[PDB]
């Protein structure tokens, strides 16, 4: 099954009170694993299986790194704002991470955003940064002049990140690698006169990745299907649905199991 490790950084200039200047959190798949911000100034676990498996030395060492990264982020946001001649409160964001795919191949990514929009995107295969405008191009030139840093980030994405992920996957395996199958039902109803709506509803499943589609007479639909978001139910499992109008059948695939519900 496909898994991923990623860390975000969020920087806010001139924040309202209650809003930290800087936050960084890690995820394995959809699960928070680590958190740091400019108020706690401490890296802390966000999953019990992280806390139980990483010695205090880990939290200490990365707390120091984060304090350093916090200050760099503040300065970079200030320089961007100057470049754009922006005043007031603006945001700066980073995402780095990797995926270990099912077939065993891997993925890595590193991106920055300014005010919630793509700004710079790293391509580890070319060792180059893609810039969205002339300001980002200015930043890109500086970063692309440092060949060692680019090599270093390629290595982190392809080797270190993947090694961290495998490590974390083992720590949280009772959670991350479990399967909870969907409870699925079809609901029928006449709504607008003449119309009949058909809802295919699933809940109670983990992992959140699910495929739901409607078919008629054993083949692909063409009419408009409406999709419900895959939403957390609050107990570690997820829920979702798909609907159409109006022999129909709902098809659900989850973790290697296919399910069909024939509408009589």
């Amino acid at each position: 099954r496909t898994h991923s490790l990623r860390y975000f950084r969020l920087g806010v200039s001139d924040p309202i009170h209650g809003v930290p200047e800087f936050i960084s959190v890690g995820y394995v798949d959809s699960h928070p694993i680590t958190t740091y911000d400019s108020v706690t100034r401490q890296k802390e676990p966000r999953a019990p299986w992280m806390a139980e498996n990483l010695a205090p030395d880990h939290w200490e060492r990365y707390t120091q790194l984060l304090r350093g990264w916090q200050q760099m982020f503040k300065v970079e946001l200030k320089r961007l704002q100057r470049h754009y001649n922006h005043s007031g409160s603006h945001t700066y964001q980073r995402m780095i991470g990797c995926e270990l795919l099912e077939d065993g191949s891997t993925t890595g990514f590193l991106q920055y955003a300014y005010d919630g929009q793509d700004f710079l995107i790293f391509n580890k295969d070319t060792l180059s940064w893609l810039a969205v405008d002339n300001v980002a191009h200015t930043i890109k030139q500086a970063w692309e002049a440092n060949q060692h840093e680019l090599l270093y980030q390629k290595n982190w994405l392809e080797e270190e990140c993947i090694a961290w992920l495998k490590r974390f996957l083992e720590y949280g395996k009772d959670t991350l690698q479990r399967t909870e199958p969907p409870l699925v039902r079809v609901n029928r109803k006449e709504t607008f006169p003449g119309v009949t709506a058909l809802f295919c509803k699933a809940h109670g499943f983990y992992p959140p990745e699910i495929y739901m589609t409607w078919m008629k007479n054993g083949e692909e639909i063409v009419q408009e299907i409406d999709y419900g978001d895959i939403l957390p139910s609050g107990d570690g499992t997820y829920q979702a649905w798909a609907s159409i109008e109006l022999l129909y059948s709902c098809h659900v695939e989850h973790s290697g199991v296919h399910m069909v519900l024939q509408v009589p």
Partner: protein
């Protein structure tokens, strides 16, 4: 560019009047990060409410889950109230009870 929050209110389990359940308010797709959320029972703030930490999406927006334990009745009405810089005043989203 700012993005106003998507607000979705739903029960943990399929709802039935009389049986203990959980009410979720999922708030997502917003930017910037500052946001205020409450659950309401008959217009008044519920006080014993759980919520996740602020969370980060790949498209740079943020999301949050607020929930509370409840027993749905035909009489009671529940909602989720949210404020965000894209909103003039708090937006109140009624639970549609399935």
């Amino acid at each position: 560019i700012q993005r106003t929050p998507k607000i979705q209110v739903y029960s943990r389990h399929p709802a039935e009047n009389g049986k203990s359940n959980f009410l979720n308010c999922y708030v997502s797709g917003f930017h910037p990060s500052d946001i205020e959320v409450d659950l309401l029972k008959n217009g008044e703030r519920i006080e014993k409410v759980e919520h996740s930490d602020l969370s980060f999406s790949k498209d740079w927006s943020f999301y949050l889950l607020y929930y509370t334990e409840f027993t749905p009745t035909e009489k009671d009405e529940y909602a989720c109230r949210v404020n965000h810089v894209t909103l003039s005043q708090p937006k109140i989203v009624k639970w549609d009870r399935d």
